Structure formats: structure tokens, C-alpha cells
């Protein structure tokens, strides 16, 4: 609660890979010049947080993962000008300093002040703000939402409507924005088109939501988990296909289904094989393929360049192509006006303490988005 000095609270520390999270008592230091201390309220568990544990996404340990949340400004640091104490807010794993090359660029959004290309696991000061035992804990994407209190650089935080249901709205901190943005912003799905979405998780279902918004005619969901097909159909999919039901490669199935290939295909899983399969399944001469999922640390993929030479465009995108600060509050507003629904993504809600259970639900396949409340 209240402060101007070190706060002691509970956080979900990950000490080693492939191990459960240890909810421990951490000392969260006060915000410095241009930083804000936020009292967390809810956090969605995304597969990227899971990649940290399984070691697919290399970032320094010990660490406090988490990047999809909504909280409340507990205090403000020297120089802050964009938020104030008591303000509802959303941390931003993709920052927007407003000064670098990309921020200037009217299209690019992968801000040069991010901690994703080369994780230091720090505050921009190059310092940590957490300590457990006596040891300093790293930050994740300068967000670290698996904690009652976290401190973010102003560059990495966005003010949201005071009437927002922080428990719903946290999905806009990643899952929905990344997925919905891939469809509408990065691939620019056209009306009457035909799309194919590989991966029916919380981000994948969001991509389907975006294709429906963008007026697509057919939305083919693809997943090796038949159970996902209901939600997929409920949020827009015109049909779902399970690769395992077939005796021929899914590209062939998809091309034939779409008489020649899909207009837009999306990879929202994170593995080398589906990325290429998704590319190949779209129309050879003008199909667009967008890589949305996060692949394993240092793995290369092999592909035949003639796939491109014909006329195919392959892209990738972080955070749905959205300029972070500008977009999250505008998105939250659209939610408020009821232009899209988040409920369909939310399968579970557990108290933060049951964090490990939420990840088990993820990994087992019974959940889409499980929200942890504080």
C-alpha cells in the first residue's frame, strides 16, 4: 500500500528453469526519476511466460515474469508526467519512448527501448528493483506482472479509463492486442477474404476476432486439440480442421479447401514447422503470411526461397503492430463502448497464489486465458 520507501510483498519468483514458481516475499524499491510503482490487480497467463520457464525464451534468472496485466498507480517518480497516483494503468512490454527511429516511423512499433531483442532483465537504469532472500531478482520485459507491486518506466506504462474493469481489460496488455492487431494492423485482412489461423489459444482466438472485424469470408481454425474448436467457432471461425485427422499434409488440405491457397495465414503457436506450413498454405502469388508465435531461442528454420519468388509476403509482428502507449488506451475505450468482447477468452480466474495451477491448466489444454487476481 502507501509509500515513499521499500515495500515488502509477495511475488512469484522463478529461480530455475522447468521449476514451479515460488511465491515469496520481495522488497520492491521506490520509483526513481521517470518510473512508476503499480499495485497489481489482475494478470493473464500467456504462453510467453511459459516459454521463460521451459527455457524456450532465454532471459536472465532469477526473475519475476508476467507481461499481461492491469493495476493501479500507487506512487509516481520524480519527473513522471503521464500518470498520477490512483490512476488505473496497463504495463507495456513493448515500450514507446517517442524519440527513437521506430517510434518516429508511422508504421513501426518495435521501439528501440525494448528489452526483448537482448534481455538484460532490467530497469532502463540497468538496475533491478527487486530483492528476494538478499539476492536481486531480474525484471521481465521491464514489466514483471506476477507481483503485487511492480515498478515500470514511464516509457513503458499507459493510462486507462477509470471505469475499466481491470480484470477484463488486462487482456489488452497482450493476448487480445497482439492477436487482434496481427489481423487488422499487420496483415490488413480484407473483406470477403479467406484466412487460416494456426493455433487456437488466447492469442489465436484474438486473431480470429480480428479477421471477423476485417470482414473475412472464411476463417479456418487449425489445431491438434479438437476441444478448442467450440470457442474458435463461437468467436468467428467458419470451420476448424485437425491436422491429425488427415493422411496428407495440412498445406495440401488447406490449399485444396481454399481452391489454391488462403489469402491470409497466421502462425500463432511458435514452432519452426508450422511457420513454414502456414507460409506454403497461402496463395502463391499474393498471399500474406504473418508469424505471430514465439519460436525457441536459437533455432533456424529451413525453407525454399521459391515460395517467396512467386509473390508471397511473409511478415512477423510484436504486440500486434500497435504503437503501445497510443494504442492501449484507445483499445480500452473501444472495449468500453462494446465493440468487441473479451469474456470468450477467459476460461479461469484464480487467486494469484494458485499461479502454478493456472500454468498447469495452460499446459494441459483445458484453458484459453486464466486470469490471476490479487
Residues acting as catalytic residues: 46, 48, 51, 67, 174
The reply on whether position 225 binds ligand CND by CB under 6 A is: yes
The reply on whether position 200 binds ligand CND by CB under 6 A is: yes
Give the footprint of a second copy on residues 18-77 (CB under 8 A). Answer: none
Cα separation, 39 vs 152, in Å, equals 11
Give how far Cα 269 sits from Cα of 56, 99, 181, 210, Å.
13, 33, 16, 17
Asked if 68 contacts 171 with a C-beta cutoff of 8 angstroms, the reply is: yes
Whether residue 202 is annotated as binding a ligand: the answer is: yes
Binds 72: which of a second copy, Zn ion, ligand CND, none (CB < 5-8 Å by kind): none
How many other CB atoms are found less than 10 A from the CB of residue 191?
A: 8
Asked if 115 contacts 94 with a C-beta cutoff of 8 angstroms, the reply is: no
State the DSSP code for 189: P
Q: Which of 148, 150, 274, 370 binds ligand CND (CB under 6 A)?
A: 274
In angstroms, give the least distance from the CB of 324 to a second copy. Answer: 12
Complex with ligand CND: residue 12 or 53, whichever CB lies closer: 53
For 281, list phi and psi in degrees, rounded to 5.
-75, -10
Alpha-carbon dihedral 167, 172, 175, 177, rounded to 10 degrees: 170
Asked if 190 contacts 214 with a C-beta cutoff of 8 angstroms, the reply is: yes
Complex with a second copy: residue 37 or 312, whichever CB lies closer: 312
For 218, list phi and psi in degrees, rounded to 5.
-130, 135
The reply on whether position 149 binds ligand CND by CB under 6 A is: no
Whether residue 46 is annotated as binding a ligand: the answer is: yes
The reply on whether position 275 binds ligand CND by CB under 6 A is: no
For residue 261, how many C-alpha atoms fall within 13 Å in the half-sphere facing its CB? 19
Residues at the contact surface with Zn ion, assessed by CB under 5 A:
46, 48, 97, 100, 103, 111-113, 174
Binds 97: which of a second copy, ligand CND, Zn ion, none (CB < 5-8 Å by kind): Zn ion
Complex with ligand CND: residue 13 or 171, whichever CB lies closer: 171
Q: How far apart are the first and last CA of the chain?
A: 13
Whether residue 348 is annotated as binding a ligand: the answer is: no
Give how far Cα 157 sits from Cα of 17, 68, 209, Å.
28, 12, 25
Q: Which of 37, 39, 47, 113 binds ligand CND (CB under 6 A)?
A: 47
**Degrees, nearest 5: CA angle 179-182-188:** 140
The reply on whether position 333 binds a second copy by CB under 8 A is: no
Stretch that binds ligand CND, among 16-24, 29-37, 44-52, 151-159 (CB under 6 A): 44-52
The reply on whether position 304 binds a second copy by CB under 8 A is: yes
Asked if 143 contacts 157 with a C-beta cutoff of 8 angstroms, the reply is: no
Cα separation, 233 vs 143, in Å, equals 33
Sign of CA dihedral 302, 306, 307, 312: positive
Give the footprint of ligand CND on residues 308-367 (CB under 6 A). Answer: 318-319, 365
Binding site for ligand CND (CB under 6 A): 46-48, 51, 174, 178, 198-204, 222-225, 228, 243, 268-271, 274, 292-294, 318-319, 365
List, as residue ranges, the binding site.
46, 48, 67, 97, 100, 103, 111, 174, 199-204, 223, 228, 292-294, 319, 369
Binding site for a second copy (CB under 8 A): 101-102, 105, 107-112, 117, 259-260, 272, 275, 283-286, 291, 294-295, 298-318, 321
List, as residue ranges, the binding site for an alcohol.
48, 67
Amino acid at each position: 500500500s502507501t509509500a515513499g520507501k521499500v515495500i515488502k510483498c509477495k511475488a512469484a519468483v522463478l529461480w530455475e528453469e522447468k521449476k514451479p514458481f515460488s511465491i515469496e516475499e520481495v522488497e520492491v524499491a521506490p520509483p526513481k526519476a521517470h518510473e512508476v510503482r503499480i499495485k497489481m490487480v489482475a494478470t493473464g497467463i500467456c504462453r510467453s511466460d511459459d516459454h521463460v520457464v521451459s527455457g524456450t525464451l532465454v532471459t536472465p534468472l532469477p526473475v519475476i515474469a508476467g507481461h499481461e496485466a492491469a493495476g493501479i498507480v500507487e506512487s509516481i517518480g520524480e519527473g513522471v508526467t503521464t500518470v498520477r497516483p490512483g490512476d488505473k494503468v496497463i504495463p507495456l512490454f513493448t515500450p514507446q519512448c517517442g524519440k527513437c527511429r521506430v517510434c518516429k516511423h508511422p508504421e513501426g512499433n518495435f521501439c528501440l527501448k525494448n528489452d526483448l531483442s537482448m534481455p538484460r532483465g532490467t530497469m532502463q537504469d540497468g538496475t533491478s528493483r527487486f530483492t528476494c532472500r538478499g539476492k536481486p531478482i531480474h525484471h521481465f520485459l521491464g514489466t514483471s506482472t506476477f507481483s503485487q507491486y511492480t515498478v515500470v518506466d514511464e516509457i513503458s506504462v499507459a493510462k486507462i479509463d477509470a471505469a475499466s474493469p481491470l480484470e477484463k481489460v488486462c487482456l489488452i496488455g497482450c493476448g487480445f492486442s497482439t492477436g487482434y492487431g496481427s489481423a487488422v494492423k499487420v496483415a490488413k485482412v480484407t473483406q470477403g477474404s479467406t484466412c487460416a489461423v494456426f493455433g487456437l489459444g488466447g492469442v489465436g482466438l484474438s486473431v480470429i476476432m480480428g479477421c471477423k472485424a476485417a470482414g473475412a469470408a472464411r476463417i479456418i481454425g487449425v489445431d491438434i486439440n479438437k476441444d478448442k474448436f467450440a470457442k474458435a467457432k463461437e468467436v468467428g471461425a467458419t470451420e476448424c480442421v485437425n491436422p491429425q485427422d488427415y493422411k496428407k499434409p495440412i498445406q495440401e488440405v488447406l490449399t485444396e479447401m481454399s481452391n489454391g491457397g488462403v489469402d491470409f495465414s497466421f502462425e500463432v503457436i511458435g514452432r519452426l514447422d508450422t511457420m513454414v506450413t502456414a507460409l506454403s498454405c497461402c496463395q502463391e502469388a499474393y498471399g500474406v503470411s504473418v508469424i505471430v508465435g514465439v519460436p525457441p531461442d536459437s533455432q533456424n528454420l529451413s525453407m525454399n526461397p521459391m515460395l517467396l519468388l512467386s509473390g508471397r509476403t511473409w511478415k512477423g509482428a510484436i504486440f500486434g503492430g500497435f504503437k503501445s502507449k497510443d494504442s492501449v488506451p484507445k483499445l480500452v475505450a473501444d472495449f468500453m463502448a462494446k465493440k468487441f468482447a473479451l469474456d470468450p477468452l477467459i476460461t479461469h480466474v484464480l487467486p494469484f497464489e494458485k499461479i502454478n495451477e493456472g500454468f498447469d491448466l495452460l499446459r494441459s489444454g483445458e484453458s484459453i486465458r486464466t486470469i490471476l487476481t490479487f
